[PDB]
Amino acid sequence: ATLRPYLSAVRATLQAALCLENFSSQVVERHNKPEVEVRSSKELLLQPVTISRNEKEKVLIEGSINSVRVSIAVKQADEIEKILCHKFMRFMMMRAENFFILRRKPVEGYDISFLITNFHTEQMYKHKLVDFVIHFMEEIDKEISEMKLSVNARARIVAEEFLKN
Amino acid sequence: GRLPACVVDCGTGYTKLGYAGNTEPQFIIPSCIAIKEMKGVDDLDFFIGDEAIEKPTYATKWPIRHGIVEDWDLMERFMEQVIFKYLRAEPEDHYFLLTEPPLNTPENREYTAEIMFESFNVPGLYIAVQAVLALAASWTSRQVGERTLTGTVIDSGDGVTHVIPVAEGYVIGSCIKHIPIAGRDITYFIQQLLRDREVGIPPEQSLETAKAVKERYSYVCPDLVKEFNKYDTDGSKWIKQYTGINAISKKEFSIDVGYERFLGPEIFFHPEFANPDFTQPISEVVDEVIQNCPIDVRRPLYKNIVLSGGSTMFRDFGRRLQRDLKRTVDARLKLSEELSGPKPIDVQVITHHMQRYAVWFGGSMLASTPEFYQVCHTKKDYEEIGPSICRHNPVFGV
Amino acid sequence: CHDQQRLEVIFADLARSWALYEDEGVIRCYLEELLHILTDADPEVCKKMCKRNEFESVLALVAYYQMEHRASLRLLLLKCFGAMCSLDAAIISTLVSSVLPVELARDMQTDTQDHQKLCYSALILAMVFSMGEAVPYAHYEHLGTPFAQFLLNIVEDGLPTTEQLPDLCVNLLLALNLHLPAADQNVIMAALSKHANVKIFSEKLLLLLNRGDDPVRIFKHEPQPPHSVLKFLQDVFGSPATAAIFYHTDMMALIDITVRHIADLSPGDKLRMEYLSLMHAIVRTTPYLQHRHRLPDLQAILRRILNEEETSPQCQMDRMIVREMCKEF
Amino acid sequence: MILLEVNNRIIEETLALKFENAAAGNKPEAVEVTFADFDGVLYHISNPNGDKTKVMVSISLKFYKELQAHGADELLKRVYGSYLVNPESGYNVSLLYDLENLPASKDSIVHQAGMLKRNCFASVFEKYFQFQEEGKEGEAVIHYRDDETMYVEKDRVTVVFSTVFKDDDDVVIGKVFMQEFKEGRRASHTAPQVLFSHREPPLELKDTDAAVGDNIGYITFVLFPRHTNASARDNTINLIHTFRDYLHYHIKCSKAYIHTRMRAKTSDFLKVLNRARPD
Amino acid sequence: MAYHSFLVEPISCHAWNKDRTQIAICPNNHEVHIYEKSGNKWVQVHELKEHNGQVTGIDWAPDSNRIVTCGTDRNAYVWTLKGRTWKPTLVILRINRRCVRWAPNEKKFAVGSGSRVISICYFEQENDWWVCKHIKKPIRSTVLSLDWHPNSVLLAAGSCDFKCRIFSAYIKEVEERPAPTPWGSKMPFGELMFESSSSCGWVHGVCFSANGSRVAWVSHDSTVCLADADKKMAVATLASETLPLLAVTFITESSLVAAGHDCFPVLFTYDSAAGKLSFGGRLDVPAGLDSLHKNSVSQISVLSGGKAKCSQFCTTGMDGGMSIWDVRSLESALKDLKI
Ligand SMILES: Nc1ncnc2c1ncn2[C@@H]1O[C@H](COP(=O)(O)OP(=O)(O)OP(=O)(O)O)[C@@H](O)[C@H]1O
Ligand SMILES: [Ca+2]
Numbered sequence A: 001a002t003l004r005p006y007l008s009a010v011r012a013t014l015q016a017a018l019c020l021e022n023f024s025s026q027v028v029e030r031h032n033k034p035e036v037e038v039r040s041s042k043e044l045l046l047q048p049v050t051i052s053r054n055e056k057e058k059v060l061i062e063g064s065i066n067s068v069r070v071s072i073a074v075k076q077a078d079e080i081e082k083i084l085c086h087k088f089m090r091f092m093m094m095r096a097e098n099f100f101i102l103r104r105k106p107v108e109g110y111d112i113s114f115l116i117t118n119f120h121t122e123q124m125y126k127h128k129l130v131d132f133v134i135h136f137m138e139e140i141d142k143e144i145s146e147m148k149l150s151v152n153a154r155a156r157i158v159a160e161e162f163l164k165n
Numbered sequence B: 001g002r003l004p005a006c007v008v009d010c011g012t013g014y015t016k017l018g019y020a021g022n023t024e025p026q027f028i029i030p031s032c033i034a035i036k037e038m039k040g041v042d043d044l045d046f047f048i049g050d051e052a053i054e055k056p057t058y059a060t061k062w063p064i065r066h067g068i069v070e071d072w073d074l075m076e077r078f079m080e081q082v083i084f085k086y087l088r089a090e091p092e093d094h095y096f097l098l099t100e101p102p103l104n105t106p107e108n109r110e111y112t113a114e115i116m117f118e119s120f121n122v123p124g125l126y127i128a129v130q131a132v133l134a135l136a137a138s139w140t141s142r143q144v145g146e147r148t149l150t151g152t153v154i155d156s157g158d159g160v161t162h163v164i165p166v167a168e169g170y171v172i173g174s175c176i177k178h179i180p181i182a183g184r185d186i187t188y189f190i191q192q193l194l195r196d197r198e199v200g201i202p203p204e205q206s207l208e209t210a211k212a213v214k215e216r217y218s219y220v221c222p223d224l225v226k227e228f229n230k231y232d233t234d235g236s237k238w239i240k241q242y243t244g245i246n247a248i249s250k251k252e253f254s255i256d257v258g259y260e261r262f263l264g265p266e267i268f269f270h271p272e273f274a275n276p277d278f279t280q281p282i283s284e285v286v287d288e289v290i291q292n293c294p295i296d297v298r299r300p301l302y303k304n305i306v307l308s309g310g311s312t313m314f315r316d317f318g319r320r321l322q323r324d325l326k327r328t329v330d331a332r333l334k335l336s337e338e339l340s341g342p343k344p345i346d347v348q349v350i351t352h353h354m355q356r357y358a359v360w361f362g363g364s365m366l367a368s369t370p371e372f373y374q375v376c377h378t379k380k381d382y383e384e385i386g387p388s389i390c391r392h393n394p395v396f397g398v
Numbered sequence C: 001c002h003d004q005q006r007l008e009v010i011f012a013d014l015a016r017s018w019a020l021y022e023d024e025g026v027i028r029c030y031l032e033e034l035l036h037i038l039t040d041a042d043p044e045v046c047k048k049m050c051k052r053n054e055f056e057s058v059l060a061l062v063a064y065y066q067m068e069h070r071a072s073l074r075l076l077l078l079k080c081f082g083a084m085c086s087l088d089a090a091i092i093s094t095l096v097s098s099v100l101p102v103e104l105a106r107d108m109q110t111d112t113q114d115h116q117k118l119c120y121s122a123l124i125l126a127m128v129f130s131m132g133e134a135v136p137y138a139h140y141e142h143l144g145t146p147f148a149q150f151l152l153n154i155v156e157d158g159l160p161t162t163e164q165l166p167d168l169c170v171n172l173l174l175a176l177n178l179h180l181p182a183a184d185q186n187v188i189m190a191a192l193s194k195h196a197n198v199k200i201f202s203e204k205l206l207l208l209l210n211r212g213d214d215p216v217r218i219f220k221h222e223p224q225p226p227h228s229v230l231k232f233l234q235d236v237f238g239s240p241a242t243a244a245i246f247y248h249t250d251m252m253a254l255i256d257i258t259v260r261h262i263a264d265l266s267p268g269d270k271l272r273m274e275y276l277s278l279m280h281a282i283v284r285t286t287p288y289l290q291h292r293h294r295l296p297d298l299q300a301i302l303r304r305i306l307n308e309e310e311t312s313p314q315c316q317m318d319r320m321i322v323r324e325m326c327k328e329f
Numbered sequence D: 001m002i003l004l005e006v007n008n009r010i011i012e013e014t015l016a017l018k019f020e021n022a023a024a025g026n027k028p029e030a031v032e033v034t035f036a037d038f039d040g041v042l043y044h045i046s047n048p049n050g051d052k053t054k055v056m057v058s059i060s061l062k063f064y065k066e067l068q069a070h071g072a073d074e075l076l077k078r079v080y081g082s083y084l085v086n087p088e089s090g091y092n093v094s095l096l097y098d099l100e101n102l103p104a105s106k107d108s109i110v111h112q113a114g115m116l117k118r119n120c121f122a123s124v125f126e127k128y129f130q131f132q133e134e135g136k137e138g139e140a141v142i143h144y145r146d147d148e149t150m151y152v153e154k155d156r157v158t159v160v161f162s163t164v165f166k167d168d169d170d171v172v173i174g175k176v177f178m179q180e181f182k183e184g185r186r187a188s189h190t191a192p193q194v195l196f197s198h199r200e201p202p203l204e205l206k207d208t209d210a211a212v213g214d215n216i217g218y219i220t221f222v223l224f225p226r227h228t229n230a231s232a233r234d235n236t237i238n239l240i241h242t243f244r245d246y247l248h249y250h251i252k253c254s255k256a257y258i259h260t261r262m263r264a265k266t267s268d269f270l271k272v273l274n275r276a277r278p279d
Numbered sequence E: 001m002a003y004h005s006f007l008v009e010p011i012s013c014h015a016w017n018k019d020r021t022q023i024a025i026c027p028n029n030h031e032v033h034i035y036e037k038s039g040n041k042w043v044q045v046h047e048l049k050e051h052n053g054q055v056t057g058i059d060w061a062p063d064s065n066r067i068v069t070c071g072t073d074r075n076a077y078v079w080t081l082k083g084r085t086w087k088p089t090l091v092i093l094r095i096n097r098r099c100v101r102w103a104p105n106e107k108k109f110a111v112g113s114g115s116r117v118i119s120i121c122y123f124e125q126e127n128d129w130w131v132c133k134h135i136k137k138p139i140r141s142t143v144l145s146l147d148w149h150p151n152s153v154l155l156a157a158g159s160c161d162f163k164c165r166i167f168s169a170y171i172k173e174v175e176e177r178p179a180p181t182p183w184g185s186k187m188p189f190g191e192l193m194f195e196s197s198s199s200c201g202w203v204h205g206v207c208f209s210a211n212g213s214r215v216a217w218v219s220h221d222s223t224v225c226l227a228d229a230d231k232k233m234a235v236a237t238l239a240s241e242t243l244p245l246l247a248v249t250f251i252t253e254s255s256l257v258a259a260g261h262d263c264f265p266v267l268f269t270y271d272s273a274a275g276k277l278s279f280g281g282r283l284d285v286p287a288g289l290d291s292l293h294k295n296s297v298s299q300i301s302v303l304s305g306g307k308a309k310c311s312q313f314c315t316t317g318m319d320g321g322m323s324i325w326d327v328r329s330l331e332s333a334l335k336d337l338k339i
Helices: A006-016 A079-097 A116-122 A128-162 B072-087 B108-119 B128-139 B185-199 B204-214 B226-233 B260-266 B284-293 B298-301 B317-338 B358-367 B372-374 B378-383 C002-013 C024-040 C043-050 C052-067 C071-087 C089-099 C100-110 C114-129 C137-139 C145-154 C167-175 C187-194 C200-211 C227-236 C246-262 C271-282 C295-306 C311-326 D009-023 D064-068 D072-079 D106-113 D116-134 D166-183 D233-240 D244-276 E327-333
Strands: A049-052 A058-063 A065-075 A112-117 B006-010 B015-017 B027-030 B031-033 B060-061 B095-100 B126-128 B151-155 B161-167 B177-179 B240-245 B254-255 B305-309 D032-037 D041-047 D054-060 D093-098 D148-152 D157-164 D193-197 D216-223 E002-005 E013-014 E023-024 E033-037 E044-050 E057-061 E066-068 E075-082 E085-087 E108-110 E118-124 E129-131 E143-149 E154-159 E164-168 E192-194 E205-208 E214-220 E223-228 E232-238 E245-250 E256-258 E266-271 E276-282 E296-306 E311-316 E321-326
Touching: A006 A049, A006 A058, A006 A128, A049 B031, A065 A128, A079 A112, A079 A128, A079 B108, A079 C100, A079 D244, A112 A116, A128 C200, A128 C246, A128 D166, A128 D244, A128 E066, B006 B072, B006 B358, B027 D009, B031 B072, B072 B108, B072 D009, B072 D244, B095 B108, B095 B128, B108 B126, B108 B378, B108 C311, B108 D244, B126 B128, B126 B372, B126 B378, B128 B358, B128 C200, B151 B284, B151 B298, B161 B284, B161 E256, B161 E266, B177 B284, B185 B204, B185 B260, B204 B260, B204 E129, B254 E256, B260 C071, B298 B305, B298 C145, B305 B317, B305 B358, B305 D148, B358 E066, C002 C024, C002 C043, C024 C071, C043 C052, C043 C071, C043 C089, C043 E205, C052 C071, C052 C089, C071 C089, C071 C100, C071 C114, C089 C114, C100 C114, C100 C137, C100 C145, C114 C167, C137 D157, C145 C167, C145 C187, C145 C200, C145 E154, C167 C200, C167 C227, C187 C227, C200 C227, C200 C246, C246 C295, C311 E214, D009 D032, D009 D041, D009 D106, D054 D116, D064 D072, D064 D116, D064 D166, D072 D116, D093 D116, D106 E321, D116 D148, D116 D157, D116 D233, D157 D233, D157 D244, D166 D193, D166 D216, D216 D233, D216 D244, D233 D244, E013 E057, E013 E311, E023 E057, E023 E296, E023 E311, E118 E154, E129 E223, E129 E266, E154 E214, E164 E214, E214 E245, E214 E256, E223 E245, E232 E276, E245 E296, E256 E311, E321 E327
Parallel strands: B006 B095, B095 B126, B151 B305, E143 E205, E205 E245
Antiparallel strands: A049 A058, A058 A065, A065 A112, B006 B015, B015 B027, B031 B060, B151 B161, B161 B177, B240 B254, D032 D041, D041 D054, D054 D093, D148 D157, D157 D216, D193 D216, E002 E321, E013 E023, E023 E033, E033 E044, E057 E066, E066 E075, E075 E085, E108 E118, E118 E129, E143 E154, E154 E164, E164 E192, E205 E214, E214 E223, E223 E232, E245 E256, E256 E266, E266 E276, E296 E311, E311 E321
């Protein structure tokens, strides 16, 4: 199931939907916003594509002429890992003010959501952005595992110390 | 409800913690935490308060720099030990009122809210302004006659002394002025003065000795000529003697305290003495702060001048302040009345009984009222809406 | 040209022992000169000068380090040895063939009052034994089951410092067991069978496993050695007595890590076959079919691995390994 | 501090200050302060009748009656004696101190008084220990917290506390710590046995108005004669009385460390993103 | 092969002077900058801050020496040089909502925008004011790229409607009649003379040939499509393995060069014989990028030579680099490239 070719098709699709450009609103006078987010013009919205490596962990990409919204639902092995994932995704969501390539709320039916704007696509390297996504996934996995091990270790130590008294 | 909430004002040089409603702090500790030079309970081995100032196996770190937080995790551990080791009160079964700086960022308030609500699961949380509670503490000098949230508050501490204009509980950021001379700088001035005047003092106890000199014998004078002529002509009743114990040899070391006792406290009235990059006196700073604010509230700001912080507890400080301010004021009034082809400008520098810890006193006085239970953001609202629930604190008590 | 002359002159003056009966300051200056020369100058010149006359200057530096009684000079010599090991593989084999390892061990056991010196000694020993090419039986007389129990106690209990030596001792442990022999002739495994009360080493090894990075591989030389964590885990899970170190929950956690690392690993790599073998050993010596957990997804993953008809030789070897380890019931 | 401190630092420091000021023969200064302690204890120290020569220390607990029902007065009289006096209005247990008549050794009195809550809760534990020592089998439920209840009951001694975990994550962390504490018999073989109950109490506490739920927990501490002895009474009591508080403090600590790790990971990722920009 | 680092942000539009002595550009700002060339180093000379938003389109009438510009400011400015200061004149666009190009006649300009109406505009000397008549027939989306034919009477434009139409913006009050073209005989203001057959991808690129015989366009479906009225308006498309192209221009009568999201200027040739388009390859062969510009190209004009034999190609992109190319050096570099 799990492979590296999944994040290669993910990287490729991310490279394909990183072709955005700045575009003014056709409905509102002198307004400029993300097309993929509001989804007001059906003519500017491309066919959203979903990629699943498994029944639990997948990535949904919804592109536009002036936006690219990538939602990522990470793997959920255990309950603790799920609570930790939720907590970390939330903690990252709070700092959406810093991450101008992420959004404050996750997409419905997904773990986390990042809105890569046309403005964001114009003031940052596309290649580096794709690299950022791939690194985001691999780092998500590795960091989650490390956090799990550390937490378990802490519990073991506290239990041993309390039992030794 | 039945129990009492906890109050904690973290200052640059000293952190004041205790229970609201009490007369004084239940624990007034130092603003420093011990750390290692990492997994498991490695973060549980953290010492805060006075028991961290002189650790040798660990390293003494300072968190609160100039009123603002620099390292969040350290402050988190510090609040942890302040809650469990120093206070030992059930956090889930108690509310909490935290203090903010004058230049506290909104995002910073958000972060504080996150650390207090997510990790501690506090039943109540309220982030207050220092000057807001300060004017309230100053409203505990004057009884019921004039207890208002209008006035100019000057909070001087170990890290930074500031002049902030307060109006009806709402501060005027555009009028707020920052001052360079703080308690640590006066302590340092005393250290240098003592370093140049007499010898026979260990270097490992020099700073503490200087602080002692700033504590016991330090007093502000009226003139810079008489305080020296009285020491030169008499010097038998003025010059005091200080005796300490060298921590190294456990022997009685002695020093002579004199002119420095006047100079250190004089550093505020004249910043030109120890700062080449500062020429403005405190009188001018307060004058400009009162003038650069709204004109309609200017009289009120000049009327309620409240002293807050430890660096303002020095003797006859507010006297000289009010003297210079009223002097310049009467001068400008005369100049305006000489070319007038004006009413008496009333000015008063208030000296509160708890002017040393006014920021915490005002908080204890606010948290004791029933309104503090209505004003404080609930844990429910915090979990339902988000951190933005702690972003705007209501002002009541008027 | 000047660097080679300074190094040769330093090596000649140090081999005169005339250096042991000289001033500490001058010796410090000479050692600092040699170290700075080996650190800032060309690699080829330092390699030729060190290996000159069949590692004459190196052997001389080793003997002088064995005769010296100064702590600081020992630290500088350890650093210079680290640089010389970072220079090439030949100098590493030469130093590993010398008694420098044994002396480093004895000094590590004797002088416990020197934290930095012990750290530099542990690091230098870790670098010297990071190849695991030659194994002298004489070196086993100074570093064996006793030293193994000592290091294991250093990891489990720890000393009274920055505590940055625990991970260094763990690294030295992983490096030493990299050149170990099978579960029957392994000293480390014997010590592990002796005192299985060590839970901390398991947690640390677990963190090291989940990290994915190798703490032993610092230099990049041709014919790189195998993975330390995998071999150590194999030697530990090679027998029930040695696999007894893992706790009730820790075993399941390690099973989760091995399964996840096995499933994430794409076909064609090298680590996948090794992790598969470790998974085979963990179900061979350890009670895997006891709580029967984590075996479902493992079964699905194994089935997806055996249906992988890759033309490459690596995936074929991996498939052969899983077919060898297919004890299904 | 890994383990929770048993003595109240506020009362200890205040009493130490008062005693140090009094030993110097200095003027008697008035004192008034309201403090609190874990499990919702309410302390209040003040000078009675405006007399600076007298210092009263009051303590109030919600389950003071249940504690007095198990012979708290006798233990309090044994511990304090002359110091123990008529309880203040509204308080549960009040002690008195006269500045005009004091002893030389101050450390003992301060260390004893600082453990007020511990000595107040130690009554039932001492009674049960003596009962187990006597061998009179076939013989308690104290509501220490508002939504919690501690239940204490031939060869062993069982102490099952039924506490509540409000936060959803705190239940998970507490479950991990309990899961580690149950098999904690691997570290020290001489240690007591540890059992854990997730949603329903143990067989002993069954249909005894047992509060069951997903947010509740019943931790069973099984001690033996080795730990229930009079020789190791004070320490074991000091730990057991602070079991819950230590658990919650440890879980919260885990939450904090998690916060730190999250901040760090956020820094690394944000660094990658900052490294993804042009300049 | 001459890339010049001017700014860090992206570029909007690229314009040149008559004798190609000065170059004008906008940096996604409320103002437009005009720089000249004095030696090896370039220096800015003029600055116009009339617009009230991000500038989208800008074109300079060479013979007239007069540059018109229109962007998000929902307005047009027909700037002309007044002494030592470029005076701007607000030409009312009359649109409730991204493209501008002067005609070969240099008398009237087309302003294609998001108002779904190619707003042609001529200058009325009778009222001393610019008037803008809007051609909106058969238009469903914004006008990405607009390019004229040699006739200076028929305009071509690609839309977000997945098609590149060639309509007529001929105002019979500003010029004489139009001769018969191979693209049709009936040429009226608003009359649709040609259109595309694509139902996918946005037509970001569109440019007509020098002979006026063929009109090509680049679609955002990773596909380029050139049409020839010489063979009964035959349409020849081709799918590029590379990403979508953003700008398209013809170098020769049968050889066109174009770039885009591929971030690398590519060359292509279309054989009139078989009647199909062919790919020449990568003319730009050598951060971490394998090309000059570190982002997608945004515009590609001609420096000198015409659309039949360009001697120098000017390329502006989202990389903040001015890419000056030469056909001679490109032909001397890639020996496997047939123009
Ligand atoms: N008895 C005293 N009289 C006058 N000044 C004092 C006395 N004791 C201490 N100080 C000075 O007051 C300073 C601390 O004042 P204060 O407590 O108001 O600041 P803080 O609250 O710790 O920090 P911040 O003002 O940034 O919040 C110290 O630097 C010290 O030098
Ligand atoms: Ca303060």
